[PDB]
Symmetry: C2
């Protein structure tokens, strides 16, 4: 039930992020929205930043579960589908997951390197860890770009990023 | 005269103090100009910093143009190399350029500078390709200087492979 309250605190924190943003956010508003004793929230989190980190952390586990289950159900072992899955699930969260434009995953490249290299039957050496870091950093910047260009994510920017990443992985993946 | 030294002082101080510790007072002091002279050109540090960035861009563009006119062959690979190598030389050598570099504006400028050179029409597609390429390169170069203070060469090379892979498909 302590865990039940945490879920709710984090959900309210996610929702509040979309409504008033990070600066206006306060611990009392979260507790009222979550319908939790205000003392619970102060007990769980030292400041707002800590609550935001727990939310970010929860975003990443959810994304990792989503991707792991898409790859498990319909993956064919290939990097094109793997790439579409990670990118599309991240785009869906970006559009659909509360507070996600403000609080992302906060590490990600590491988690994705583990996840994907297992799936692809590839040895995560330095070269491959670098490729992944490069891919993840560029996808982050291009996704951010797409959403500055149009509020739901400019489709042409997104499609350029997809093409860009396919060309790169097509070139560097042996 | 005074404008030049104000921007020189702004560029250095950036490097010595960082952006938000940077103040109009400190720049005037460094530039050997009355504080009032700074306010004659700029109402605030953000305008001052954008002015510096605009100067950076003019210099970058003239270096690129000179390099391309001297030894360019009309091909996208040497243009990519020039454009990327000149930016990297500036990150390492140009004052303040790590903390304020170019201030769309870069992408638009490169489109103008490079579209005639390459025989490519400056349409919306080319603009978008350049915008994606600039944003990518910017993040990847930031990444490279985060991993080593001279710019991590293996990151730099991945970025170069990545941009060649993209442009070769898309051009």
């Amino acid at each position: 039930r302590s865990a039940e309250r945490l879920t709710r605190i984090l959900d309210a924190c996610a929702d509040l992020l979309d409504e008033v943003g990070y600066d206006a956010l306060s611990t009392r508003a979260v507790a009222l929205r979550a319908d939790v004793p205000i003392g619970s929230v102060y007990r769980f989190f030292g400041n707002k930043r800590q609550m935001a980190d727990a939310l970010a952390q929860r975003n990443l586990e959810r994304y990792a579960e989503r991707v792991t289950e898409r790859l498990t159900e319909a993956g064919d072992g290939g990097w094109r589908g793997a790439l579409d899955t990670v990118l599309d699930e991240y785009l869906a969260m970006k559009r659909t997951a509360p507070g996600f434009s403000l609080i992302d995953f906060g590490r990600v490249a590491e988690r994705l390197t583990e996840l994907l290299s297992g799936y692809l039957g590839r040895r995560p050496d330095d070269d491959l860890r670098r490729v992944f870091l490069v891919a993840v950093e560029t996808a982050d910047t291009l996704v951010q770009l797409a959403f500055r260009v149009a509020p739901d994510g400019d489709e042409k920017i997104i499609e350029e990023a997809r093409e860009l990443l396919r060309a790169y992985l097509g070139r560097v993946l042996d």
